């Protein structure tokens, strides 16, 4: 109600239909909430937490498309309400997350009759389209050292700490790389004094220098 | 009118506003019709021809996002009508093209009041979002030899001939590669009997074998 900006634009009938069909859900970290064509739960409003939209190759390789934080809305968890979305994505909780779910059939129904809700969904798609376009630009134009540097700066901002407790597999899965290549890269960073590597931990030593890689 | 599927869904007032403001335009090949934030002409309905949506790095490197053919609609040529589209694209004519342009201000106005036109624009975005998602999947999971093989099979289908009259630069610009890497790859293909290379021409010799690379 406070976290849904379309609320002031909705009428009484629309406000009531969504309100009376809101599903509250606490999702623990590591839970897959949407898994391509298998699920079509609905739009997710993140009250508090962190979600990760990604794609999987048939060989189990992964790359993160984008992340959703507190107050974001997930549209692709209700992908089946749009025939023209002909790609599948996996959405999972990176931290314990409190969500509200607006059922797909309900949201689809309101969207059919409301230009405001229809246009709002366009703006939501355009944002995610733009997120994915920044990703193509990053993948094509920036080398792996710069992308690892960029990721380490993002995670430290999200966690509010220069001490990351993640595996080399998770970094590889974020960037569309292999663990061995990430490990090689982190060891090059350690030799260059950018990070410190220890048991289940990457400590960012020079945040100023990592930012100059990202920018290079 | 025949090429615009939303026409039957429009009312008299909407049909008249679009009809009386249609701009007919013959565009010669090599003409840039949209160049990021510089232009915001409108939605383009391709009566007959071929358009190419691509992105440019600050160093002049290119990769094709998707192609539009006869009967397709271009949405991103009117990107400024959606605040949430925060990426720029270049659109140009690959062959001489006959277009109709629906001015952006006019289309935006109809979209504000019509759920049908609003939802139709979503489906148009979703299609292009899906095109770009196939591209991420191709870039990440398929090696350059497979992507070159895939492109050669596409161009031969479009041109209706196993004889392509294109430069190594154009192929590099389609795939996000460098000319020298494409030339190296085409020479490997020639050594393997897949193609024949001669003055300003690539002749596909084994279309069956190129398809088995694409699929690998």
Q: What share of chain B is helix, strand, coil (3-state, %, to 5)?
A: 50, 25, 25
d(CA B148, CA B61): 17
d(CA B68, CA A40): 30
Nearest to B122 among A122, A127, A136 (CB): A122
Looking at the DSSP assignment, which residues form a beta bridge with residue B202? B164, B197
Closest by CA position to B66, among listed B130, B160, B8: B130
Looking at the DSSP assignment, which residues form a beta bridge with residue B176? none
What are the b/e assignments for A54-93, b being 16+ CB within 10 Å?
bbeeeeeebbbbbbbeeebbbbbbbbebbeebebbbbbbb
Closest by CA position to B56, among listed A135, A65, A141: A141
Q: Which of B63, B65, B129, B178 to mutate to test the interface with A (most CBs of A within 10 A)?
A: B129
Q: Which of B59, B64, B78, B84 to mutate to test the interface with A (most CBs of A within 10 A)?
A: B84
Pairing of strands A42-48, A163-164: unpaired
d(CA A21, CA A147): 42
Taking the Cβ of residue B7 and every Cβ of chain A, the question of whether any pair is shorter than 8 Å is answered with no
Q: Mapping DSSP to helix (H, G, I), strand (E, B) and coil, where does residue B49 land?
A: coil
Cα B133 to Cα B63, B65, B126, B138, distances in angstroms: 14, 9, 10, 9
Q: Which residue of A has its CA nearest to B60?
A: A141
The CA radius of gyration of chain A, in Å to the nearest whole number, is 19
Q: Which residue of B has its CA nearest to A123?
A: B84
Q: Which long-range contacts (CB under 8 A, 24 or more apart) does A76-79 make?
A: A76/A34, A76/A128, A77/A33, A77/A34, A77/A39, A77/A40, A77/A41, A77/A42, A77/A43, A77/A44, A78/A40, A78/A41, A78/A42, A78/A43, A78/A104, A78/A107, A78/A108, A79/A40
Question: Which residues 37-56 on chain A approach chain B with CB closer than 8 angstroms?
Answer: 55
d(CA B108, CA A171): 42
Residue numbers in A near B128 (CB within 8 A): 129
Q: Which of A118, A123, A181 to mutate to test the interface with B (most CBs of B within 10 A)?
A: A118
Secondary structure, 3-state, A104-126: HHHHHHHHHHCHHHHHHHHHHHH
Domains of chain A: 1-139 (2.60.120.10), 139-216 (1.10.10.10)
Q: Mapping DSSP to helix (H, G, I), strand (E, B) and coil, where does residue A95 land?
A: coil
Taking the Cβ of residue A71 and every Cβ of chain B, the question of whether any pair is shorter than 8 Å is answered with no
Which segments of chain B does DSSP mark as H helices, in order?
A: 12-20, 104-113, 115-141, 144-159, 168-175, 179-191, 207-215
Backbone angles phi, psi at B160, to 5 degrees: 65, 40
**Sign (positive or negative) of CA dihedral A200, A206, A208, A214:** negative
Report the structure determination method.
Answer: X-ray
d(CA A127, CA A15): 24
**Sign (positive or negative) of CA dihedral A39, A41, A42, A46:** negative
């Amino acid at each position: 109600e406070n976290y849904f900006p379309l609320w002031n634009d909705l009428n009484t009938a629309q406000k009531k239909l969504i309100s009376d069909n809101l599903i509250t859900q606490h999702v623990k970290k590591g839970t897959i909430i949407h898994n391509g064509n298998m699920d079509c739960t609905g739009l997710l409003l993140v009250k508090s937490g962190q979600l990760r939209t990604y794609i999987l190759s048939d060989e189990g390789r992964e790359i993160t498309l984008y992340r959703l934080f507190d107050m974001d809305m997930c549209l692709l968890s209700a992908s089946c309400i749009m025939r023209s979305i002909q790609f599948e994505v996996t959405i999972e909780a990176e931290k314990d997350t409190d969500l509200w779910i607006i059922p797909a059939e309900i949201y689809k129904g309101i969207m059919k009759d409301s230009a405001p809700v229809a246009n709002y969904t366009n703006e939501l798609m355009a944002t995610r389209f733009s997120d994915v376009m920044w990703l193509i630009e990053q993948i094509m134009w920036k080398s792996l050292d710069k992308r690892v540097a960029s990721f380490l700066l993002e995670e430290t901002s999200i966690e509010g700490t220069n001490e990351l407790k993640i595996t080399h597999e998770t970094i590889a899965n974020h960037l569309g790389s292999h663990r061995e290549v990430i490990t090689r890269m982190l060891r090059y960073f350690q030799v260059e004094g950018l990070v410190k590597l220890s048991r289940g931990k990457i400590t960012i030593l020079d945040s100023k220098r990592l930012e100059t890689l990202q920018r290079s």
